[PDB]
Design a protein around this ligand. Structure first.
Ligand code: ADP
Ligand code: ADP
Ligand code: MG
Lengths: 347, 78, 306, 467, 74
């Protein structure tokens, strides 16, 4: 049931007045949130795509990245919209009123922010963001203030991903680097792309499957560390899956094994790859050639191509989370577009 | 192979010229090549030098700020 | 006055850029051919167009007059070209170096003199542009390429603050900052990169300016009362127009709702001002041919003098 | 006979025999380029039989270009068989990284390569018309093929940006891609309000073509404020190259130039990152900088830059880099020529020349180490269609049609814009006509006309009419 | 209000006042000096405005910039 492939034609079309930047999914109801280049934050419903549920203008500049999470205390939804107005915003969804409820705005960045993430490990919600300030920043959602600011790269980081206490960060200086969350020490550095990193994310655990070559751990060290394989997307028209090495387990970097290893490379895109989202055996990725491609982990070949999905650039993709048991991986996936349109595939 | 600039195409003119450069170079006489800038004097001269087994090649390129020190240093190389 | 807006406005935009570095004769001939081109392509324009009367209001004209600028029309037009270039940095070419005091009077204490021949030029320039004080540069014929980003205005909008790089590091700029370049020698060679990106304005004196200045002197000395009457009628016409506009605004604000003695007094004042305006227009209609006779009278002295 | 060659005394030619190596004749060039085109067409065996017409067409076109455009018209019309060799190399590097080829596609590819190697140096518009007539005559004489479209420079847009291979691309798709990529470039780099037109699309394509070749250098000739270095920065940002900018003021000497060149060479070799060197016209004060460029371009590097302790530490750094990459190189000759191969592969230099009529610019374009090894690109002035397109794109923001405008019946050659329907076309035609009259009446002669006056007038016009 | 219009794609409504001012509420431009009669919108978006001043002005709305720029007037 995890091997679903969307059909060729779009299910329905969502009309936006300006360029769509970041699209997210509501993990409980069929609700999609659509960004704008003008800064307006939308919330479309998949069944009735006629009018938005809540069109809120939050920033005078463009917004770049989003994250959405339904919390699990020991509950509600949090939407964060990183923007180009030197600050980020945090929103709370009200199901009864069907309108956006603002919570707070976190400050501190000295340039525009391009990435944002939110998660929980043990009854504490944290928000990360990364900007053109060359520094990775962290926040506490309940407290509201930062915990650790540090620069991993000479140039400016672009995208991030996280689980537990480990953060990797793609950068404009075409290098990847794991950044440890409490200590702030770089365990390993990576090289091999020829262009800045657009998006990059982890590949996580799954319980039961017939055969796996890119998610399952190999040894007991991989098994208890839990961080094995990562995939990076960069402007050199290539997508690569990267082996991360072991630390000297605050963990210490390995002097002879502090370098990443590219395992499998994927190519065939006609422009820059923009965003990736792994879902079981299938690596869904976009590009700037008006197309979205579907890549397999095992054979390393694109099974399906969606040519001319839009008339312009395709900006961002996002799926439902599948490596956790809290949120089921529903068969829904929605794309963005530079040509003021958004398309969702269902069933 | 067309990216490499040492590739020559033998015709009657370049083989007649290779014969005359062998004849003059074996005669212990100086040789002055004077033609238009597209005639390929450097290419044909290196073609006559590198394929042979009796002559060698030194890399000297004269310029406005060139003295006998560069010539002497190139002489010490071989 | 609205059917010919696109014709009068296209002349002044042409007049700012192309005509900064020409003498009076060539400027007049090019304006003649510009009027011919405007009339050819069926675009109407004001037949009594005057650039000073188009852009330069009375207040800025006086404020330029008691800052040190002369009463010549050519210098007034060149000063209007200089102080209406928001996008391009202006260039000043005056052999006498007279108008440094003029810009110092106009900008007050904010005028800071700098020179390309100095050694601490970069530090004081970056301090002045961090402040935002107006900067005047002398020795324009010795242009130094370290301000290549300032001349071309290739600022990068890094966040909410505007950013430039000058020299070898990072400096910040403010919206108050304005740059001026002054040159002394008219025959001094100027680099093409500087020449093609500035408003090159020539504050010089040529033979056509000899004719114009001798005309000005003979009118202000031979018949001074005529020039005084012209200045008086222009000033009273401007003052009466401003007073009538203010009275009209007051009358409309008073009578917007719904009669009393306030509205009747305002209507009587408006009637008196309208009659005064009509009398002033009737007086000024039959006065320009006297100036036409005067300029047809005093041309032989100009030809003799040239 | 040419300047820059000092006539030597008879006392040196006394003891040396002398020869004259003339140009090869038509038959020799024909046979040599039969061998070349057989080697190139070995990649695609379906068109092997077309080796003779292509070589005959190239030889005849080179002979006609040599006979028509002479040195008397312009000082840089020094054609040579080296241009034919560069044409062959360009055709090879286009076929090798190209799609499944076709006869019409092959003829269009050869035509595009001839356009970019033979007539990108021409100045007059009638010279380019004569060249396109020459292309028509050569194609109709040696390759009698029908169903062949336009051969003008606007309709021959071969690009590698839009796909994974060197193939022809659509005009509107390329214009939209350049628009969006330039918007992203202005967002991520220095901001400049540049407008998009087809002449700049052709120029940005040809400079991208020149900046992707191995040891690819070119010189840009055009008037000031034509937008040369911004296009160079745009291509070098597209290809991932790193901009190095020689920041030379008036109080500068050869030491600063040598240290910038040394830093660029060290970053090119040790840090293995490709660099683009934009050498401006004002960045060359004396002839020593020109001599340094001659040494760097005629050869692969500067032997005078590293001497003594600098040479020793350079060899130590090269040995450290070679041992880091695990390459078995021991002798100094192998390290040195590998280093100069790295420099020749990972360093591209470009030149921006504003006024070619200057004595310094004449000495630059008359240099023997610059003219032969760089692709001469002549931007020139702005033709009337480019000015009309720029003005139409810049005046459409403001409301202008608010008057009772009747269409005036004027002559056909007096209208540069597409024929008048609104007041905007009349305004654009008036502006272009005044600019032409002003540049005619100031006796500019054959000097290039800087179009910055037109752009400044357009900006002042739109702001003033808004107010 | 003399006329009412709505955006056929995005959730935007165009309102034209009786004094000639046009407001776009999810901008304020006076397309005509006199009172406007009626408006029509067709999908570039072109809005045609007709008034009693014997002059019909057509304006276009920029969605990204949230401003209205006039194109031509009859
Ligand atoms: N007989 C030939 N065979 C092969 N190539 C030739 C022949 N004659 C001329 N050429 C071409 O002509 C060009 C001349 O270049 P070059 O040798 O640099 O000229 P020069 O020696 O005058 O500097 C070369 O690129 C070469 O490929
Ligand atoms: N449409 C246009 N075409 C060419 N140049 C323009 C245009 N619009 C503006 N410019 C100006 O051209 C400059 C870039 O030209 P540049 O390549 O620096 O000229 P140069 O090569 O003579 O130095 C910009 O600073 C900009 O102000
Ligand atoms: Mg030669």
């Amino acid at each position: 049931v995890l091997k679903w492939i969307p059909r060729n034609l779009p299910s329905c079309l969502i009309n936006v007045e300006s360029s769509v930047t970041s699209v997210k999914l509501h993990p409980n109801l069929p609700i999609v949130f659509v960004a704008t280049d003008h800064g307006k934050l939308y919330a479309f419903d998949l069944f009735n795509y006629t009018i938005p549920l809540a069109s809120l203008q939050s920033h005078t500049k463009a917004i770049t990245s989003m994250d959405v999470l339904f919390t699990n205390y020991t509950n509600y939804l949090v939407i964060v919209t990183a923007s180009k107005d030197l600050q980020i915003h945090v929103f709370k969804w009200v199901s009864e009123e069907c309108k956006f409820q603002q919570i707070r705005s976190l400050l501190g960045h000295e340039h525009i922010v391009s990435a944002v993430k939110i998660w929980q490990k043990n009854n504490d919600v944290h928000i990360a963001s990364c900007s053109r300030d060359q520094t990775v920043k962290i926040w506490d959602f309940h407290n509201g203030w930062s915990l650790k600011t540090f620069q991993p790269h000479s140039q400016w980081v672009r995208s991030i991903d996280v689980l537990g206490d480990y953060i990797i960060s793609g950068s404009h200086d075409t290098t990847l680097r794991l950044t440890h969350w409490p200590s702030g020490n770089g365990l390993s550095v990576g090289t091999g792309h020829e262009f800045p990193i657009e998006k990059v994310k982890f590949i996580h655990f799954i319980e039961d499957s017939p055969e796996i070559r890119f998610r399952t751990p190999s040894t007991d060290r991989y098994k208890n560390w839990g961080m094995q394989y990562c995939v990076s997307a960069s402007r050199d028209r290539t997508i690569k899956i990267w082996e991360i090495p072991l630390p000297t387990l605050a963990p210490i970097p390995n002097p002879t094994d502090s370098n990443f290893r590219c395992v499998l490379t994927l190519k065939g895109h006609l422009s820059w790859v923009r965003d990736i989202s792994i879902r079981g055996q299938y690596l869904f990725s976009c590009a700037d050639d008006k197309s979205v491609r579907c890549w397999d982990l095992n054979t390393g070949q694109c099974l399906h191509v969606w040519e001319k999905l839009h008339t312009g650039f395709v900006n961002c993709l996002d799926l439902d989370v599948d490596f956790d048991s809290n949120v089921t991986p529903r068969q829904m996936m929605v794309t963005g577009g530079l040509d003021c349109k958004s398309n969702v595939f269902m069933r | 192979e067309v990216m490499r600039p040492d590739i020559v195409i033998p015709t009657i003119d370049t083989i007649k010229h290779e014969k005359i450069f062998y004849d003059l170079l074996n005669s212990k006489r100086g040789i002055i090549l004077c033609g238009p800038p597209g005639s390929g004097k450097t290419m044909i001269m290196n073609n006559a030098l590198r394929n042979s087994s009796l002559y060698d090649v030194v890399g000297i390129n004269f310029s406005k700020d060139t003295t006998t020190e560069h010539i002497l240093s190139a002489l010490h190389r071989h | 006055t609205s059917q010919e807006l696109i014709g009068n406005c296209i002349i002044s935009s042409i007049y700012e850029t192309y005509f900064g570095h020409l003498n009076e004769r060539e400027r007049g001939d090019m304006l003649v051919i510009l009027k011919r081109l405007l009339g050819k392509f069926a675009v109407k324009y004001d037949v009594n167009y005057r650039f000073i009367d188009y852009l330069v209001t009375l207040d800025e004209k006086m404020k330029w007059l008691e800052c040190g600028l002369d009463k010549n029309d050519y210098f007034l037009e060149n000063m209007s070209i200089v102080m209406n270039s928001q996008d391009a940095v202006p260039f000043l070419l005056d052999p006498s170096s007279h108008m440094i005091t003029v810009i110092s009077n106009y900008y007050g204490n904010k005028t800071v003199l700098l020179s390309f021949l100095e050694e601490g030029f970069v530090k004081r320039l970056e301090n002045a542009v961090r402040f935002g004080s107006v900067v005047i540069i002398q020795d324009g014929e010795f242009f130094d390429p370290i301000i290549s980003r300032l001349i071309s205005r290739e600022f990068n909008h890094a966040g909410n603050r505007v950013t430039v790089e000058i020299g070898d590091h990072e400096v910040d700029v403010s919206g108050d900052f304005k740059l001026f370049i002054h040159s002394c020698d008219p025959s001094g060679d100027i680099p093409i990169f500087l020449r093609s990106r500035v408003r090159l304005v020539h504050f010089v004196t040529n033979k056509e300016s000899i004719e114009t200045r001798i005309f000005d002197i003979t009118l202000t000395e031979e018949n001074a009362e005529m020039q005084r009457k012209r200045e008086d009628l222009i000033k009273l016409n401007t003052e009466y127009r401003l007073k009538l506009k203010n009275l009209e605004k007051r009358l409309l604000e008073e009578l917007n709702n719904s009669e009393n003695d306030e509205l009747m007094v305002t209507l009587n004042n408006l009637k008196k001002e309208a009659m005064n305006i009509e009398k002033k227009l009737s007086e000024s209609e039959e006065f320009f041919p006297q100036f036409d006779n005067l300029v047809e009278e005093y041309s032989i002295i100009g030809k003799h003098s040239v | 006979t040419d300047p820059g060659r000092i006539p030597m005394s008879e006392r040196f030619t006394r003891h040396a025999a002398i020869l004259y190596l003339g140009y090869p004749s038509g038959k020799s060039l024909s046979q040599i380029y039969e061998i070349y085109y057989k080697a190139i067409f070995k990649l695609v065996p379906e068109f092997r039989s077309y080796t003779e017409p292509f070589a005959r067409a190239s030889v005849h076109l080179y002979n006609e270009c040599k006979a028509r455009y002479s040195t008397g018209l312009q000082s840089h019309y020094l054609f040579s068989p080296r241009e034919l060799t560069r044409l062959v190399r360009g055709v090879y590097t286009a076929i090798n990284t190209g799609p499944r080829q076709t006869l019409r596609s092959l003829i269009r590819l050869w035509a595009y390569e001839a356009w970019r190697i033979f007539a990108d140096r021409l100045v007059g518009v009638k010279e380019k018309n004569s060249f396109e007539q020459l292309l028509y005559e050569t194609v109709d004489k040696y390759l009698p093929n029908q169903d062949l479209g336009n051969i003008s420079s606007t309709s021959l847009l071969f690009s590698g940006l839009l796909s994974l291979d060197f193939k022809e691309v659509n005009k509107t798709d390329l214009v939209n891609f350049i628009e969006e990529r330039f918007k992203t470039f202005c967002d991520e780099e220095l901001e400049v309000p540049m407008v998009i037109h087809e002449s700049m699309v052709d120029h940005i394509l040809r400079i991208d073509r020149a900046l992707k070749q191995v040891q690819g250098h070119m010189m840009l000739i055009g008037a000031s404020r034509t937008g040369k270095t911004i296009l160079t920065r745009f291509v070098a940002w597209l290809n991932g190259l790193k901009i190095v900018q020689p920041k030379i003021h008036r109080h500068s000497n050869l030491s600063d130039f040598d240290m910038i060149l040394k830093k660029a060479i060290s970053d090119c070799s040790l840090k293995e990152s490709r660099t683009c060197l934009i050498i401006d016209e004002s960045n060359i004060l004396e002839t020593a900088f020109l001599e340094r460029m001659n040494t760097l371009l005629a050869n692969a590097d500067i032997p005078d830059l590293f001497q003594g302790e600098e040479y020793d530490k350079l060899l130590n750094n090269l040995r450290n880099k070679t041992r880091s990459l695990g390459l078995l190189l021991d002798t100094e000759q192998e390290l040195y020529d590998w280093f100069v191969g790295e420099i020749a592969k990972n360093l591209h230099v470009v030149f921006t020349i504003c006024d070619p009529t200057n004595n310094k610019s004449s000495a630059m374009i008359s240099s023997p180490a610059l003219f032969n090894r760089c692709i001469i690109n002549w931007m020139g002035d702005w033709d009337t269609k480019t000015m009309s397109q720029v003005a139409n794109n810049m005046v459409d923001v403001v409301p202008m049609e608010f008057t009772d405008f009747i269409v005036p019946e004027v002559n056909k050659e007096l209208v540069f814009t597409e024929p008048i329907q609104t007041i905007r076309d009349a305004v654009v035609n008036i502006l272009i006509h005044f600019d032409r009259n002003f540049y005619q009446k100031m006796k500019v002669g054959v000097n290039p006309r800087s179009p910055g006056y037109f752009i400044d007038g357009l900006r002042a016009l739109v702001k003033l009419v808004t107010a």
